[PDB]
Design a protein around this nucleic acid. Structure first.
Ligand SMILES: [Mg+2]
Ligand SMILES: [Mg+2]
Ligand SMILES: [Mg+2]
Ligand SMILES: [Mg+2]
Ligand SMILES: [Mg+2]
Ligand SMILES: [Mg+2]
Ligand SMILES: [Mg+2]
Ligand SMILES: [Mg+2]
Ligand SMILES: [Mg+2]
Ligand SMILES: [Mg+2]
Ligand SMILES: [Mg+2]
Ligand SMILES: [Mg+2]
Ligand SMILES: [Mg+2]
Ligand SMILES: [Mg+2]
Ligand SMILES: [Mg+2]
Ligand SMILES: [Mg+2]
Ligand SMILES: [Mg+2]
Ligand SMILES: [Mg+2]
Ligand SMILES: [Mg+2]
Ligand SMILES: [Mg+2]
Ligand SMILES: [Mg+2]
Ligand SMILES: [Mg+2]
Ligand SMILES: [Mg+2]
Ligand SMILES: [Mg+2]
Ligand SMILES: [Mg+2]
Ligand SMILES: [Mg+2]
Ligand SMILES: [Mg+2]
Ligand SMILES: [Mg+2]
Ligand SMILES: [Mg+2]
Ligand SMILES: [Mg+2]
Ligand SMILES: [Mg+2]
Ligand SMILES: [Mg+2]
Ligand SMILES: [Mg+2]
Ligand SMILES: [Mg+2]
Ligand SMILES: [Mg+2]
Ligand SMILES: [Mg+2]
Ligand SMILES: [Mg+2]
Ligand SMILES: [Mg+2]
Ligand SMILES: [Mg+2]
Ligand SMILES: [Mg+2]
Ligand SMILES: [Mg+2]
Ligand SMILES: [Mg+2]
Ligand SMILES: [Mg+2]
Ligand SMILES: [Mg+2]
Ligand SMILES: [Mg+2]
Ligand SMILES: [Mg+2]
Ligand SMILES: [Mg+2]
Lengths: 54, 122, 100, 146, 155, 113
RNA sequence: GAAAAGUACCCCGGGAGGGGAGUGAAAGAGUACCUGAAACCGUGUGCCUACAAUCCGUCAGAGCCUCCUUUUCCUCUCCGGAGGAGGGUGGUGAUGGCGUGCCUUUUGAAGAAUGAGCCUGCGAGUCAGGGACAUGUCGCAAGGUUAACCCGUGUGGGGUA
RNA sequence: AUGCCGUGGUGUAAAGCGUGGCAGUGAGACGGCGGGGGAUAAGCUCCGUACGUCGAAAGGGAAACAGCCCAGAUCGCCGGC
RNA sequence: CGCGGCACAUCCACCUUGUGGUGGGUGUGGGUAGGGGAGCGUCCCUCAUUCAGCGAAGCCACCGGGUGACCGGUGGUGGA
């Protein structure tokens, strides 16, 4: 099966705009006084110092 | 002498693309497709310039019929009576009158009704 | 008051002070023209009669000569190689109604 | 140029038609014309002029007995063998208002504007309607003599 | 396409490929291919009869004479040493127009060299007069010997 | 309208579509929020984009002398850069082309209360 | 670039790259470099679009947005015009009618016959000959004309076979 | 009955005839009328028809609908029959 | 049919009374293969003239024009 004809700009764009990244929600944490923002699932690691904030 | 085509050849391309502004798809972007759409567009415009006279007459007739039946007479007999009375007011102006001066339209209806024959079926 | 003036093969509903674009008249700019009418409404009266109307004319003043919109024609037929381009620009005359 | 209706130009009124003995086709034509606004000199085919129409006593409309016995109403569900037929008699037994509404809708122009036009139609089977807040003036079918 | 380098063999198979058959790589539709009906060396020259040639030259000189643009001089420079300055002064005295034709004998080297490099001055021998040069010239300047030679040649 | 600073990253070796996927996450946000959104974004193109945004903020603070705490990512987009072409051999002697696309990433940050 | 005068120095950055400075008439010439079109890909923005069956246009046509002018109003008016009305540009197009893509080949194709993904550039009645026929025009005219060749800086003058 | 030849009148611009230059065409289709072949079937096949349309003809009508009915588009008009 | 613009042919009178123009009647102006007539645009040479580092070409936008191919003006970019 091969495409019968090339898609139109609108038809291509409607599908192409659905390929996007989901944004992760971030919470606030303070380590050694400095305050950072981390994803909530890493809150325990951030508190215990296993997170390298760079 | 050898002549490059580009300078001469771009004039019709620019004109066609300028004329095809507002089309959607390839029809406003590519010269070859805009050319075909231009052919169709100008044929449609030529046909519709002639057909719109009939369309406007149709609209006028409909509005005149509405006003006549409001004044209790058919379009049939209103036109026949106006012809008999020798009133040569246009259909366009008749519709304009019907919308703008209903009293004048009523007066015209009485004139046509008077000019109508005593029995229209003889 | 207003009237239905006949000119150039067409009819126009005009009142005093109106400006109308009509077909070209062989009249220069500035001078006056008198035109026949098909109906005169002066409130409740319509006068609806050839004899009474033939003695009434509207007086207009030629405001100038203009042109209609440019019309482009490109006649075309399906599989023939037939094409025909053509342009047109109708000549018009502008009237200012001052009479009735 | 000829008059072109603007937004806010159009005015609407309320009409109530009693269908106690009117022929179905006659009633449908009258209602369709009223809905579309063909009775007004300001009519334009691209503008939804026209007035609200209420039909009462829809169960009393005049239909011939052979029509009640033989006129079919068809529907296809989309599945194979999905054709369902009922007689006008059964339809009048169950939903008399639907017979009238279907007749009226068959007479409107088949375009988008008719979808918005038909929203002004109310058909009731009994002699009562809830729109007493509006004041529907009675409308009777008349024929202008020619 | 027969003279472009290469292009001898058929590039690939006619059938079973899905592409246009091509015959040679130097076909005119190819980039770098041959030129169709292109320029070749040509000889531009016509067989105008002598009677017409002579009549045209005579008409040109007649126009010049009738309008009064014909001058005759004995010589251009007094001595045997060319002097562009004096020659230019002499022609400026004779006429003031941009283009000048000078007809002098083939043996008058001092006169030739004196006006050789003056802008707007053209030199030719009496037996080499022709319509293009005469019509280009605003004025015609004859040496006496040149004028007599031309008149004697044409009887 | 607002004081601003610009930064550009030309010839970055990431496909423009892949760069857009992460740019759309931070367009319009403040610099501080955009930086950590890109920090915790799992996509690989989050690195270069974060570098450009940080460089633009640095330009604003250093050259323009603007307060870093008020910087907002106002404009950001990714254009196509030059594309290099490679060949991938396939079955039965066929040879397919491969494109190595690059991007030009432009960021404008402006300071506003 | 006329000339390397090919960006000292500082900043972000592992680099790449960039910003500020600086050179230059010009960086709207930064060794990816004269000019810098189209296809193609973004970002901002005005209008429209999630009850509708659309060869994608055309004719009719409301409503919005924008920019200018004629009125009456803020008369602060030297203002300027907010704003009110009218009129006109330009953008968009709810809604109504009409409407079977181009080429080729065919008796006949919107055709479910052929060909074309798109743009830019290139790609097909030419040249030779005192050839042949017919015409327009010019010179000479019961005559017209030279070929080879000769002489001239040439396109000019000779040359009767 | 028509059709055909000649002749005298009347009418009719873009008929006709001669001689040259330049062609294209030589696969036609459907409909009406008269016939052959076929089974008096074929959207079948072959002839005739100063018969028509299409081909190479747009517009209105026949729901749509080369060949049927009306009618031959120089252009413009928001005029009329 | 009405009113206005265009073109071809013919006729009628004027101007050089056919090389052709002036005005007025009448007819005509669907069109494939094909025949005839007249034009637009690009480049090069020659003659005359004219513009150009106070900005040529090319490109882009806008505002206009012609019966057609097409044209002009203004601005921006650009650098012969
Ligand atoms: Mg499978
Ligand atoms: Mg649009
Ligand atoms: Mg008509
Ligand atoms: Mg055909
Ligand atoms: Mg070879
Ligand atoms: Mg071969
Ligand atoms: Mg090569
Ligand atoms: Mg070559
Ligand atoms: Mg010779
Ligand atoms: Mg192998
Ligand atoms: Mg400098
Ligand atoms: Mg420059
Ligand atoms: Mg430059
Ligand atoms: Mg490049
Ligand atoms: Mg460049
Ligand atoms: Mg909706
Ligand atoms: Mg449908
Ligand atoms: Mg539409
Ligand atoms: Mg339809
Ligand atoms: Mg076939
Ligand atoms: Mg096809
Ligand atoms: Mg298909
Ligand atoms: Mg087929
Ligand atoms: Mg085939
Ligand atoms: Mg096939
Ligand atoms: Mg294909
Ligand atoms: Mg030649
Ligand atoms: Mg001859
Ligand atoms: Mg016989
Ligand atoms: Mg012949
Ligand atoms: Mg044969
Ligand atoms: Mg045959
Ligand atoms: Mg038969
Ligand atoms: Mg038979
Ligand atoms: Mg057959
Ligand atoms: Mg037959
Ligand atoms: Mg054919
Ligand atoms: Mg037809
Ligand atoms: Mg015919
Ligand atoms: Mg038809
Ligand atoms: Mg009638
Ligand atoms: Mg005709
Ligand atoms: Mg013709
Ligand atoms: Mg032809
Ligand atoms: Mg300069
Ligand atoms: Mg040039
Ligand atoms: Mg320029």
């Amino acid at each position: 099966a091969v495409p019968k004809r090339r898609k139109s700009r609108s038809n291509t764009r409607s599908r192409r705009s659905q390929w996007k990244a989901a944004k992760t929600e971030l919470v606030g944490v303070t380590v050694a006084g400095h305050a950072h923002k981390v994803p909530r699932r890493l809150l325990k690691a951030a508190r215990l110092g296993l997170i390298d904030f760079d | 002498a050898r002549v490059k085509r580009a300078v001469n050849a771009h004039k019709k391309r620019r004109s066609i693309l300028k004329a095809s502004r507002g089309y959607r798809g390839q029809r406003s972007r590519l010269y070859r497709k805009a050319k075909e759409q231009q052919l169709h567009s100008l044929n449609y415009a030529y046909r519709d310039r002639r057909a719109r006279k009939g369309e406007f007459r149709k609209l006028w007739i409909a509005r005149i019929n509405a006003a006549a039946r409001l004044n209790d007479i058919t379009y049939n007999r209103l036109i026949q009576g106006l012809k008999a009375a020798g009133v040569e007011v246009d259909r366009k102006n008749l519709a304009d009158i019907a919308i703008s001066d209903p009293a004048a339209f009523t007066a015209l209806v009485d004139v046509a009704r008077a000019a109508l024959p005593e029995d229209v079926n003889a | 008051t207003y009237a239905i003036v006949k000119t150039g093969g067409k009819q126009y509903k005009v009142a005093v002070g109106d400006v109308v674009k009509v077909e070209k008249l062989e009249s220069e700019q500035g001078e006056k023209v008198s035109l026949p009418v098909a109906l005169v409404v002066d409130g409740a009266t319509v006068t609806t009669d050839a004899k009474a109307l033939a003695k009434v004319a509207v007086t207009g003043e030629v405001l100038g000569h203009t042109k209609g919109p440019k019309i482009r024609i490109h006649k075309f037929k399906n599989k023939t190689g037939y094409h025909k381009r053509q342009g047109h620009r109708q000549q018009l005359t502008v009237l200012k109604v001052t009479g009735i | 140029p000829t008059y072109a209706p603007k937004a806010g130009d159009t005015t609407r009124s309320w009409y109530v038609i009693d269908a106690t003995d009117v022929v179905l086709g006659r009633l449908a034509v009258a209602a369709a014309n009223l809905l579309r606004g063909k009775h007004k000199p300001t009519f334009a085919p691209n503008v939804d002029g026209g007035d609200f129409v209420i039909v009462i006593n829809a169960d009393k409309v005049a239909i011939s007995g052979d029509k009640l016995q033989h006129k079919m109403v068809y529907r296809h569900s989309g599945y194979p063998g999905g054709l369902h037929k009922r007689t006008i008699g059964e339809l009048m037994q169950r939903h008399p208002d639907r017979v009238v509404e279907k007749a009226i809708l068959g007479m409107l122009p088949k375009n988008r504007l008719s979808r918005q036009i038909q929203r002004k139609l109310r058909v009731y089977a009994g002699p009562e309607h809830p729109h007493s807040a509006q004041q529907p003036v009675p409308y009777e079918l008349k024929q202008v003599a020619q | 396409r027969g003279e472009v380098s290469g292009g001898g063999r058929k590039p690939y198979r006619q059938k079973g490929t899905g592409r246009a058959r091509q015959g040679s790589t130097r076909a005119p539709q190819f980039t770098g291919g041959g030129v169709v009906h292109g320029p070749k060396p040509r000889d531009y020259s016509q067989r105008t009869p002598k009677k017409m040639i002579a009549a045209a030259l005579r008409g040109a000189l007649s126009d010049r004479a009738r309008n009064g643009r014909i001058h005759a001089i004995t010589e251009l420079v007094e001595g045997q040493n060319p002097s562009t300055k004096s020659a230019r002064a002499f022609l400026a005295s004779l006429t003031e127009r941009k283009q000048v034709l000078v007809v002098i004998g083939r043996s008058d080297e001092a006169g030739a060299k004196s006006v050789r490099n003056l802008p707007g001055v053209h030199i030719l021998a009496p037996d080499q007069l022709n319509t293009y040069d005469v019509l280009r010239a605003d004025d015609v300047v004859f040496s006496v010997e040149a004028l007599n030679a031309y008149i004697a040649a044409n009887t | 309208e607002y004081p601003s600073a610009v930064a550009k990253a030309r010839f970055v070796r990431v496909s423009p579509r892949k760069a857009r996927r992460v740019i759309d996450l931070v367009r319009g946000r403040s610099v501080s929020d955009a930086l950590d959104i890109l920090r915790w974004a799992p996509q690989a193109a989050s690195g270069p984009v974060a570098k450009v945004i940080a460089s633009a903020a640095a330009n604003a603070q250093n050259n323009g002398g603007l307060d870093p705490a008020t910087l907002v990512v106002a404009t950001v987009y990714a254009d196509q850069g030059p594309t290099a072409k490679r060949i991938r051999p396939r079955a039965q002697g066929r040879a397919f082309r491969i494109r190595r696309r690059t991007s030009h990433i432009t960021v404008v940050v402006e300071s506003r209360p």
